[PDB]
Design a protein around this nucleic acid. Structure first.
Ligand SMILES: [K+]
Ligand SMILES: [K+]
Ligand SMILES: [K+]
Ligand SMILES: [K+]
Ligand SMILES: [K+]
Ligand SMILES: [K+]
Ligand SMILES: [K+]
Ligand SMILES: [K+]
Ligand SMILES: [K+]
Ligand SMILES: [K+]
Ligand SMILES: [Mg+2]
Ligand SMILES: [Mg+2]
Ligand SMILES: [Mg+2]
Ligand SMILES: [Mg+2]
Ligand SMILES: [Mg+2]
Ligand SMILES: [Mg+2]
Ligand SMILES: [Mg+2]
Ligand SMILES: [Mg+2]
Ligand SMILES: [Mg+2]
Ligand SMILES: [Mg+2]
Ligand SMILES: [Mg+2]
Ligand SMILES: [Mg+2]
Ligand SMILES: [Mg+2]
Ligand SMILES: [Mg+2]
Ligand SMILES: [Mg+2]
Ligand SMILES: [Mg+2]
Ligand SMILES: [Mg+2]
Ligand SMILES: [Mg+2]
Ligand SMILES: [Mg+2]
Ligand SMILES: [Mg+2]
Ligand SMILES: [Mg+2]
Ligand SMILES: [Mg+2]
Ligand code: NA
Ligand code: NA
Ligand code: NA
Ligand code: NA
Ligand code: NA
Ligand code: NA
Ligand code: NA
Lengths: 52, 159, 203, 119, 50, 103, 125
RNA sequence: AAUUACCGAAUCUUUGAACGCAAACGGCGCAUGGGAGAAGCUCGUGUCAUCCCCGUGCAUGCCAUAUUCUCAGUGUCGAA
RNA sequence: CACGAGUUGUUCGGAAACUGAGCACAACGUUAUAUCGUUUUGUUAGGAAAGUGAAGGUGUGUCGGCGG
RNA sequence: CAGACCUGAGUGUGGCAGGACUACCCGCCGAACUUAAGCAUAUUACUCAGCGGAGGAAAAGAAAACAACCGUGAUUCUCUCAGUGAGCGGCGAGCGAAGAGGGAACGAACUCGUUGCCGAAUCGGGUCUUACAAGGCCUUGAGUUGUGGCACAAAUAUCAU
């Protein structure tokens, strides 16, 4: 529930269906996150040492 | 500017909150017609300036040097009692016929007790609209309170 | 005198009229700076007791200090060594907030000599103290016998050395005799006397 | 009260008395005439320096290292009464500044070299 | 190479002027104790690193 | 032990946003008097791609309600926004795709 | 020998002192040419006497200027604007310290008590 | 006018708390006094645009102060 | 090793004079402690940081124009 | 409208702070090695390291003090009290003072607030006196939202002439 004076734009946001395509490559994930932030590749904690 | 906002917001919550009687009594001031007459009587008996006081004492010195045997009075002309310490003593010793108190003294604790002290001593008092108007009457920038101890014969009906 | 009415008025601090006056002031003090210079003291009766005179060269500042206890500045609350020294939040500073307010004023303005200070207000998160300071270079100060002493150099930054009244309080100098034997003239002066090893020449 | 057409307050411009000129804190006596002797220290008498005198009408001098190319031209006028049409300066690897001063065709560099005493 | 601050060039210039042997006549003074410059420097031995 | 990588990421350091090559924050225009009472008409000038974002962005040209100048907002485009489209923002705006209306 | 006597220099005016300074500065610069172009040892022995004569000329010029300017600012109306270079240096602390006049300031009661009960000189038999 | 010792008078480059602004820059300023000026104007004399050189002031904060300087506030009045 | 030399600019490189990833003086806040924090998502600071100035009024210089 | 005074800016004028030193001294902050034949309270130690601030010394200092007497009499220091039939302590390892007494020093005492009586007699700034006079004259400038004078136990007036 929001106040009725808050504004909204009519329609759906563009670029829909992006998640539908498989990436197929570790190189395509490299370019996707290049504009986002430093979060990839992802090491699994079971693959680390108990100190970390 | 922050000081402009804070002085206006100050005035807002002095009306929004519940003010006890000890502070509300200063918002209920004497009416304008009587305030003007009181200030005219205070101005008539204003204290003498530095120039006037020193000329009077210079003359008194000459009348002393004319004859060292006789003592010449150095008493100042009749005026109002001015100052927090001196006005308080006029109330406690019950020498004040009337006391005029200013309503915008800050800190208010300087004069917050004057109405109750005058009331306990059965001394007429009035709370007036400005401490600068009281200061103008006596010749200074501001005045917290003024007491009338006596007046001349021609001003007894006005008092 | 008029002092007697301002003095007894400020002893009734919990009264309705004084709670109203302090509530408007504490709200106002919040929206000001940490150090604020004032033309006149908020409590002239208290300031005059502690050394303030309405003369040239006497200044009043209101200083704000945050309330609460001292949190030990250790990374992530991680302390090493004996568990006796493991506390982070429960420890308390050995200096009162009045001395902290005086020292924060004195370090900021080094051209002034801190004389005293007094309590004016406290709120849930803040505490306000008004610090009396003197200008050593003022001719009025330099010719007045009653404040002449502060122009001397032993009185430079006396608040940083615990020499003000608030500093004397947390040093234990309020007490004398058997309440103060180990802390007189100072805790280190008493320690040196009890712990130095004396070698008389012939023994 | 006033009318404000901006959405925020800015400081009003008030009257500003200009700062006065104090009595000078530098009272040492400095002679205007001897300043050219500091700019030009002494000439260079090496083989390369002597070569430029005859063919390039050029006099080589060691000058103040903080000296200006325009100040070297004025100092050559005051000291030797010659006109320098070009001054080339380098700061030497030992810290000194050497000036290559070319004189106008009206002045013979060999004649002025003789008057200086470096012949 | 080509770039150096003038302050750095002026420190290197002083070090060049100090890289001289003791004059011969210094050794003939009455209470002399200097024979060679003990502060001689070679670019390949010790680096100033300015 | 040592610090966990998930906690190290809260320091910022090398785990912050690669914001270079981004156009900026995409927002609706300010809820001013014209929005609250009438409407503002704008023209879509371009449809842009921002690095790190999968939705298209739209630069919409408005006039300044008080000054003689243009504003050039930048907001997330809805699907179907085209260049040359007229965008209405306010209380009196019609119910068409791309218009900003009170809820 | 190019040695200017200090007694002769102190009798000259500021114009004669500056004319003498220019004359000695010019002759020192001609001796720097002799230094580069070989030079007789008797001519190179004139460099030090000239350099010290220049120092003597500049000492009399600067000593005269400072004493003349100190007299100028000794006036009662100008004592406030005296340049700090001409004021007394002493020490940073001694300049800020209380003077003997301000140190000895007494109250009215203190002065009266010192007049009522002055310290006496006495002996015992 | 030896040379030593001591000290009242002086000099005291670039920096540094370093403080006009900066700085792996011997860099760049604003006000105000000067200096030199072979172009131009004047009758080699004066004067001198651009350029160049030098002295002084100019950090921030605080205190005091203003022949009683200039202002701001839907702070309190007071008169319009 | 010794002695003596050699680096020449209106236009080349830098600076004067640009912005970037960034830094952090001021301001404010914090801290027993400033030697801490914020300081580019258009951008400091509860925040009065503009000393610059369209038109117009007043005189000077350089002009056009009417009338005498 | 003016105008005031309250709060707050801007500029001019006169100044001050800044850093060094830091053995000793003042304020805070503060370990661990070590000892306990292990170790956690304890000890090392209210110490090292860290952050501030002065001076030739600093600090303390004129009783809201000891005592329990036939009484002493600001502070500081020394011998002594006393390694204590004090006390604190896994009552373990260890720690641990005070009054009195003999002395060093000591012309050692004053100031404000308050309360009573006064009330601008006060302070800055100009100018004069050989003088930025503890002086005269002027000064709204600051101060009556109070600074200065008189008396408060070493006391019993002060204020004229
Ligand atoms: K003792
Ligand atoms: K090195
Ligand atoms: K000139
Ligand atoms: K107003
Ligand atoms: K080239
Ligand atoms: K910082
Ligand atoms: K100043
Ligand atoms: K062991
Ligand atoms: K003391
Ligand atoms: K004794
Ligand atoms: Mg990665
Ligand atoms: Mg592994
Ligand atoms: Mg603590
Ligand atoms: Mg070059
Ligand atoms: Mg190279
Ligand atoms: Mg290099
Ligand atoms: Mg600098
Ligand atoms: Mg700096
Ligand atoms: Mg070699
Ligand atoms: Mg940036
Ligand atoms: Mg940010
Ligand atoms: Mg902001
Ligand atoms: Mg052990
Ligand atoms: Mg062990
Ligand atoms: Mg301990
Ligand atoms: Mg230490
Ligand atoms: Mg001593
Ligand atoms: Mg002392
Ligand atoms: Mg005693
Ligand atoms: Mg024994
Ligand atoms: Mg112990
Ligand atoms: Mg008093
Ligand atoms: Na801990
Ligand atoms: Na090269
Ligand atoms: Na970011
Ligand atoms: Na060589
Ligand atoms: Na310091
Ligand atoms: Na050890
Ligand atoms: Na003793």
């Amino acid at each position: 529930s929001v106040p009725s004076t808050s504004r909204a734009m009519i329609g759906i946001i563009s670029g829909g269906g992006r998640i539908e395509k498989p990436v197929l490559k570790a190189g395509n994930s490299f370019y996707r996150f290049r504009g986002k932030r430093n979060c990839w590749p992802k090491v699994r904690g079971v693959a680390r040492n108990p100190v970390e | 500017p922050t000081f402009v906002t804070m002085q206006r917001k100050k005035r807002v919550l002095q009306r929004r909150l519940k003010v006890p009687p000890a502070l509300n009594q200063f918002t209920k001031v004497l009416d304008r017609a009587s305030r003007n007459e009181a200030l005219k009587l205070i101005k008539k008996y204003a204290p003498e300036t530095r120039k006037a006081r020193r000329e009077r004492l210079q003359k008194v010195a000459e009348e002393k040097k004319k004859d060292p045997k006789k003592t010449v009075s150095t008493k100042a002309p009749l005026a109002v009692v001015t100052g927090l310490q001196e006005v308080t003593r006029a109330i406690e010793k019950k020498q004040a016929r009337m006391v005029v108190i200013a309503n915008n003294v800050d800190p208010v604790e300087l004069v917050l007790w004057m109405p109750n002290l005058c009331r306990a001593n059965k001394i007429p008092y009035a709370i007036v609209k400005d401490m600068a108007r009281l200061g103008d009457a006596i010749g200074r920038k501001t005045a917290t309170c003024v007491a009338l101890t006596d007046v001349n014969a021609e001003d007894e009906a006005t008092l | 005198g008029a002092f007697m009415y301002l003095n007894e008025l400020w002893k009734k601090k919990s009264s309705d009229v004084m709670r109203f006056i302090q509530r408007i002031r504490s709200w106002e003090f919040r929206h000001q700076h940490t150090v604020v210079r004032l033309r006149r003291p908020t409590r002239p009766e208290k300031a005059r007791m502690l050394g303030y005179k309405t003369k040239q060269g006497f200044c009043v500042f209101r200083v704000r200090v945050r309330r609460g206890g001292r949190k030990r500045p250790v990374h992530k609350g991680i302390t090493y060594g004996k568990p006796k020294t493991s506390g982070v939040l429960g420890m308390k500073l050995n200096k009162n907030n009045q001395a902290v307010a005086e020292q924060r004023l004195g370090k900021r303005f080094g051209n002034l000599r801190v004389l005293n200070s007094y309590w004016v207000n406290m709120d849930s998160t803040f505490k306000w103290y008004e610090v009396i300071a003197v200008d050593p270079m003022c001719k009025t100060i330099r010719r007045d016998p009653r404040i002449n002493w502060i122009v001397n150099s032993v009185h430079k930054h006396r608040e940083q050395r615990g020499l003000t009244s608030a500093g004397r309080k947390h040093r234990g100098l309020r007490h004398k005799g058997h309440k103060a034997s180990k802390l007189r003239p100072s805790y280190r002066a008493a320690w040196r006397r009890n712990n130095r090893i004396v070698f008389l020449r012939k023994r | 009260r006033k009318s404000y057409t901006r959405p925020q307050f800015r400081r009003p411009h008030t009257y500003r008395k200009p700062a006065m000129a104090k009595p000078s804190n530098r009272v040492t006596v400095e002679s205007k005439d001897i300043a050219a002797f500091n700019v030009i220290r002494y000439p260079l008498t090496t083989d390369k320096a002597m070569k430029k005198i005859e063919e390039n009408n050029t006099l080589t001098f060691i000058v103040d290292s903080r000296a200006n190319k325009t100040e070297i031209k004025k100092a050559m006028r005051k000291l030797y009464q010659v006109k320098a049409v070009k001054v080339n300066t380098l700061i030497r690897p030992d810290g000194l500044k050497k000036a290559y001063i070319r004189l106008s065709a009206a002045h013979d560099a060999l004649d002025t070299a003789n008057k200086i005493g470096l012949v | 190479g080509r770039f150096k601050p003038l302050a750095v060039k002026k420190k290197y210039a002083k070090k060049m002027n100090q890289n001289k042997p003791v004059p011969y006549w210094i050794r003939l003074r009455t209470g002399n104790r200097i024979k060679w410059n003990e502060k001689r420097r070679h670019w390949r031995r010790t680096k100033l690193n300015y | 032990g040592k610090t966990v990588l998930s906690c190290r990421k809260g320091n910022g350091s090398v785990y912050q946003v690669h914001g270079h090559k981004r156009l900026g924050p995409a927002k609706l225009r300010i809820l001013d008097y014209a929005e609250r009472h009438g409407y503002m008409r704008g023209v879509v000038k371009s449809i842009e791609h921002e690095a790190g974002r999968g939705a298209a962005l739209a630069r919409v040209e408005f006039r300044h309600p008080y000054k003689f100048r243009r504003v050039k907002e930048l907001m997330v485009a809805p699907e179907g926004m085209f260049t040359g489209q007229s965008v209405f923002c306010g209380q009196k705006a019609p119910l068409a795709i791309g218009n900003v209306l009170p809820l | 020998s190019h040695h200017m006597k200090i007694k002769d220099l102190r009798e000259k005016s500021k114009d004669d002192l500056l004319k003498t300074l220019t004359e000695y500065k010019k002759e020192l610069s001609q001796l720097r040419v002799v230094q580069q172009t070989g030079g007789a040892e008797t001519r190179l022995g004139r460099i030090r006497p000239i350099r010290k004569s220049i120092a003597r000329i500049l000492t009399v010029l600067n000593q005269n200027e400072r004493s003349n300017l100190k007299m100028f600012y000794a006036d009662r109306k100008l004592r406030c604007k005296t340049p700090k270079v001409l004021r007394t240096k002493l020490t940073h602390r001694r300049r800020l310290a209380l003077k003997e006049n301000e140190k000895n300031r007494k109250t009215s009661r203190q002065m009266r008590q010192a007049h009522k009960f002055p310290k006496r000189v006495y002996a015992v038999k």
